[PDB]
Amino acid sequence: NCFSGYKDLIKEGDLTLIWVSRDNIKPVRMHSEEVFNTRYGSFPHKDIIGKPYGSQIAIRTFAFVHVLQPTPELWTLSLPHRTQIVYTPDSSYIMQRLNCSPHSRVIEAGTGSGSFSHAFARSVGHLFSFEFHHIRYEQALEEFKEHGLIDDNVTITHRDVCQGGFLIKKGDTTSYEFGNNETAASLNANVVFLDLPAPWDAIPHLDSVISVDEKVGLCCFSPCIEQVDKTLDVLEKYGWTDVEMVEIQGRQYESRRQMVRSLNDALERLRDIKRHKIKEGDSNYKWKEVTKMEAEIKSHTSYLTFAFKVVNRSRDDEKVNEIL
Amino acid sequence: NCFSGYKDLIKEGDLTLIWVSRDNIKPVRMHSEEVFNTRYGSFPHKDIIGKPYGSQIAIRTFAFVHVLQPTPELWTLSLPHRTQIVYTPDSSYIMQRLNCSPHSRVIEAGTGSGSFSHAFARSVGHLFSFEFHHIRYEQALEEFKEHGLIDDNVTITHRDVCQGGFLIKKGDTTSYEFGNNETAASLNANVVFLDLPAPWDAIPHLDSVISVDEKVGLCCFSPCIEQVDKTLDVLEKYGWTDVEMVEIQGRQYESRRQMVRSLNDALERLRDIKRHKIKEGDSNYKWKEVTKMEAEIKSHTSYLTFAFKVVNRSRDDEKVNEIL
Amino acid sequence: HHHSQDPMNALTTIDFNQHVIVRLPSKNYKIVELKPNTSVSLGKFGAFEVNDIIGYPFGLTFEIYYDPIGKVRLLSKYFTVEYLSSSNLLQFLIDKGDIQRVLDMSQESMGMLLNLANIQSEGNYLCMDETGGLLVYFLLERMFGGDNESKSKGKVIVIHENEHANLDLLKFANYSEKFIKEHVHTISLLDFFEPPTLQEIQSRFTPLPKEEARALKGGKKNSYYRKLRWYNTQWQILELTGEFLYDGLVMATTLHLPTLVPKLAEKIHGSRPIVCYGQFKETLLELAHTLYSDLRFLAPSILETRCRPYQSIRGKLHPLMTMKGGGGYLMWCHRVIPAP
Amino acid sequence: HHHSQDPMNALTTIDFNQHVIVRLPSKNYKIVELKPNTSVSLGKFGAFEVNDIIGYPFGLTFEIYYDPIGKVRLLSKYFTVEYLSSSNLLQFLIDKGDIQRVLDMSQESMGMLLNLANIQSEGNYLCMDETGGLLVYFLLERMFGGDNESKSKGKVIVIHENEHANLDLLKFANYSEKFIKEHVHTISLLDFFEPPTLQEIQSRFTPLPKEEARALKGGKKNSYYRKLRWYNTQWQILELTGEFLYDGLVMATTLHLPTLVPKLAEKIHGSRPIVCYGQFKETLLELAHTLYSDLRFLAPSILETRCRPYQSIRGKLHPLMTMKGGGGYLMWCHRVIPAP
Ligand SMILES: C[S@@+](CC[C@H](N)C(=O)[O-])C[C@H]1O[C@@H](n2cnc3c(N)ncnc32)[C@H](O)[C@@H]1O
Ligand SMILES: C[S@@+](CC[C@H](N)C(=O)[O-])C[C@H]1O[C@@H](n2cnc3c(N)ncnc32)[C@H](O)[C@@H]1O
């Protein structure tokens, strides 16, 4: 993955994220004969290649961009704004509550634009991702491939998980590379994230693919509270416990300044009226530091329903005896 | 109402609110031979009576209280903490969205502890309040009476509004004083607030008591979202429009200070360790002003469902012609 | 009036020469003055005849249809007509993009300000309002409900930064000029803190005995009463600035609060609320620490209220996905009198 | 080991000599060390034999019953045994009242910090942690998942205020002392900013040729290697403080950030994230304005994340009525390299 590890110098062929402004971050593949364009100027790649990652790049009549190494957080900010993706406040909370680590073996459906996928892949032992829509599947496959996710720890599979479950067998449409004598993947998932219209149709299929000897964590991502209600019903029927729904609310603040305007100065203007019978931070004036909420807030992304399961609720009795 | 108007001096017999601390406000009736007790000392009423409202009262070995004129906001803060009452963030929003004023004629059920009642009564043309529980009814009646609400603009009636509706007839258990030739109150409500377990059972009875020639506003107060769902159903059936549910979230912040601790001072301590081979705001130190959220927040009080109705959806056609 | 029949109630009913609210299908607001025998254009959504909506209650939705000015009927494109409440005026100003002009205030913050300040029909309130009068309008509507014939005697006293107050939003309010001059008094910061003395005023004018003044006519009568109105303006300032104590202080100003609020509070009675609205919490934090040192203020608190609406469709309930941030903050405290 | 059979996986399975989490019926947490042939008291809820829970998966609820130490069976009073995750350690510290010790941090704020900082198994991260090591523990668990045998080579470098680091919470972590010394390096602010020079170090000690040092025995060998460990400590400081550039900076300190973060960021590579946690937003606001002036920092942002749980019972869904306030704030930005 070009998302993984820490690169020093920008090289020809590298995928970069070019920061133009806070709301304008563009994925750009470096090529010596290409030019990057902004509403403020043109930035030739040959004047970028060879410089350190994190470089500010300047052109005269001055205009600037910053060239950054891809990261899931930054990649997520670069995706089309109104779309159906998981943002960092939700996903970072989900990964932390489900305790993600190289120990994690995760099942994600559906893949969508792969926002959560990239954050999973950075941290996790393996990611098994499922996508119902064949065009979306092919786009995600091509992109995961290009990014180096496929040759690292990510598998994607074209599947309707509500109808066909989560098994990956030789012959299925999948990126999975089967080992010697392997005719089916052994998913052995201990982490499950469902982002689907009807997660309650997918939950029954999980018993065939989750780990049987450890606590398995699940999060379902649903926009409407009647969807949460259907999920709570089916989680209970299929033996999932410690069930809790939460919401996550993220806010961002600008650092700003408000002009200090004294009473005495207002009085002095009134006295002078009687006799006759600015850019923020301007050093001619006094300023007070203040925080200002972002103009538009994401007041709802989805409800997050967490649940846990242990299949083999037992121990090896005399293996414990055989320790003495 | 001793809640209404603005008193100058504390008089014998006055109901006061004695502020002991932010979470300790006590209703105390002034009587020259009585004494008010606090975990910090005893405050004789005779040393309070005759002083201006808002007076800080001091006793030696010094301890203090402040004696305030009753107000709905303060009264609400003085009620038992865990109880089922409406707090100022919800009620002030409800009154503003329903545009409360002396023009308002309101219907409230149930009365409960009368938190919202007092805020209504301050602003509104008349308040018609209904309480199902006979002991609660008698307590609210006695208290409203004592406070002067009953002899001003408040009526309370012992009623199950879901079963018996909202009509007030001579013979009913009510505080209503019937005028000459009056055998029934004409409620003519243009504002309705329902705080009940099943507001959808009360909504059908409203058509008999609401104003018929103006926009009528309704707010239903329900803790669970399945309750909101039942309300949305019945509001639609009975012709209520512009229906919207919202939540109100209130937070309070303390003004605090955090000690400023420089790098250089930490280095200098490390240098001295090498050679050998406070109360907040303390003037010996530097401090930064900060805001600190209250330790416990009210993260949910109830869902607020608003709705509006016009009964006579018509005009006087040639009365409009008769203007030319 | 000159009609024998009872007039229409402009608080309940769409009426001639009133400023009213019109909600478009895109849900943004317009303010429309209902001049008789005129038409109103809603651009894309058509135009209609003012006369055709008079006499209806507020809250109705009208369809414009054509057999360019259309006809109207109750909706069986369209618009909804509403009373111009304090809430709807605020929303209209936000729709038209004036959010910084109103200092980022929200319906819920202003609603809470009214109750924290204990605003009542008979109170005399000290007020600073930098919004063009939106705060004064919230007060008046709560106090009087739009009723020009109200018998209540409450007043809003507005202290302001320039020579004249900016209360232009009151031009939308449907209060008469008489009502406003009886319930709203304006006075500059300078006149409020350094008022003229009686001697200073009388040495420029002392009235004629009223028998003599009554007998004046022509240009001498007009010349004199113009001087007498100046005299009464000055007299009112004396009344407002003496040992008169007010029933509450409400503020929406961007002046420096720590150096202003303590001076204003000298004229507030013991036990009365003080409420300062601020767009930025840090502003109020500085104020609260200042007031903490001053025993004339009881327990200053910074409060926040935020409304989150839901998509209120049965079978698809969830909060709105996106909405506007902001809404500001309130500093609440009470004026009190320290013990010796 | 000395058993022929495969050992138990302490990441999936309740195991001897592990520190684990116990959730009581009152839902508060305890941390319990599972020493073989010992008993554990839960006060009111009874006591049990450690041996009787070994070998089970985490996540199960056990009933204590009596025919005072009881017997245990799966719940058909009781307790639930959980892995000691970074989340559960934080919750345990909050339950026991140590909320100010952990600077009011929440699960969601720490979860976001991990991802904003792009924390990975192979990264070398600069860290300040005033919590007794809770932040270091969040990092290690994300990087290595509790796996003492992990092949990953990532490191947390902890810069600290006193002579020694306070990382006592790591005593609960079930990482071996070897693992910790290979992945956690500690260095004081003074050693980090004013490190010793090579000349200074060698003039107090230069090693013997390793053939000669190997041939040492007795007290001379012990005397020498003690000096050689001091030498290696100093050498490690040279490695950590030279022209070594780090992959990220994460901070949870109450030191003055505006005067500290720019100095620390000199050792961070271009394009790497900087995340400062703060209990108070005003602190971070001051920092953000400071960093705005410094072209080595790209677009500093103050972020907030808040979790609100629901009562998750079908037919009675609503958010929790009351809960703890706070949870703190993050300042996020990226180190960048200005153009000439
Ligand atoms: C909102 S998106 C997922 C976004 C993704 N979590 C992210 O962070 O970028 C939902 C995706 O689920 C896919 N999907 C829907 N139903 C599915 C099913 N039954 N099986 C697999 N995928 C499905 C849809 O095609 C869509 O791409
Ligand atoms: C939560 S309380 C109201 C609190 C009140 N809003 C306040 O702010 O203090 C609910 C009250 O409704 C009353 N109530 C319940 N069902 C009722 C009914 N059918 N008719 C009238 N009152 C009812 C209950 O006795 C209870 O006192």
Curated annotation (Swiss-Prot), chains A, B:
Keyword list (alphabetical) reads: Methyltransferase, Nucleus, Phosphoprotein, Repressor, S-adenosyl-L-methionine, Transferase, tRNA processing
Q: A Gene Ontology biological process annotation? A: tRNA methylation
Entry-linked Gene3D superfamilies: 3.10.330.20, Vaccinia Virus protein VP39
Q: Which residues form a coiled coil?
A: none
Q: Which GO terms describe its molecular function?
A: tRNA (adenine(58)-N1)-methyltransferase activity
InterPro entries noted in UniProt: SAM-dependent_MTases_sf, TRM61_C, tRNA_MeTrfase_Gcd14
rRNA processing keyword on record: no
- Subcellular localization, as worded in the UniProt entry: Nucleus
Q: Which family does it belong to?
A: Belongs to the class I-like SAM-binding methyltransferase superfamily. TRM61 family.
**PANTHER family referenced in this protein's UniProt entry, alphabetically:** TRNA (ADENINE(58)-N(1))-METHYLTRANSFERASE (PTHR12133), TRNA (ADENINE(58)-N(1))-METHYLTRANSFERASE CATALYTIC SUBUNIT TRMT61A (PTHR12133:SF2)
Q: What does this protein do?
A: Catalytic subunit of tRNA (adenine-N(1)-)-methyltransferase, which catalyzes the formation of N(1)-methyladenine at position 58 (m1A58) in initiator methionyl-tRNA. GCD14 is also required for repression of GCN4 mRNA translation by the upstream open reading frames (uORFs) under conditions of amino acid sufficiency.
Reproduce the miscellaneous comment text: Present with 7220 molecules/cell in log phase SD medium.
Specify the protein name.
tRNA (adenine(58)-N(1))-methyltransferase catalytic subunit TRM61
Q: Which organism is it from?
A: Saccharomyces cerevisiae (strain ATCC 204508 / S288c) (Baker's yeast)
Q: Gene name?
A: GCD14
Curated annotation (Swiss-Prot), chains C, D:
Write down the Pfam families for this protein, in alphabetical order: Gcd10p (PF04189)
The subcellular location is:
Nucleus
Q: Does the keyword Signal apply?
A: no
Residues in coiled coil: none
Q: Which GO terms describe its biological process?
A: tRNA methylation
Keywords on record:
Nucleus, Repressor, RNA-binding, tRNA processing
Q: Which GO terms describe its molecular function?
A: RNA binding
State whether keyword Nucleus applies.
Answer: yes
Q: Under the cellular component aspect of Gene Ontology, which terms does the record hold?
A: nucleus; tRNA (m1A) methyltransferase complex
Q: Which domain of life is it from?
A: Eukaryota
Described by its record, this protein's role is as follows: Substrate-binding subunit of tRNA (adenine-N(1)-)-methyltransferase, which catalyzes the formation of N(1)-methyladenine at position 58 (m1A58) in initiator methionyl-tRNA. Also required for repression of GCN4 mRNA translation by the upstream open reading frames (uORFs) under conditions of amino acid sufficiency.
Q: Could you share any additional remarks the record makes about this protein?
A: Present with 2580 molecules/cell in log phase SD medium.
Q: Which family does it belong to?
A: Belongs to the TRM6/GCD10 family.
Q: What is this protein called?
A: tRNA (adenine(58)-N(1))-methyltransferase non-catalytic subunit TRM6
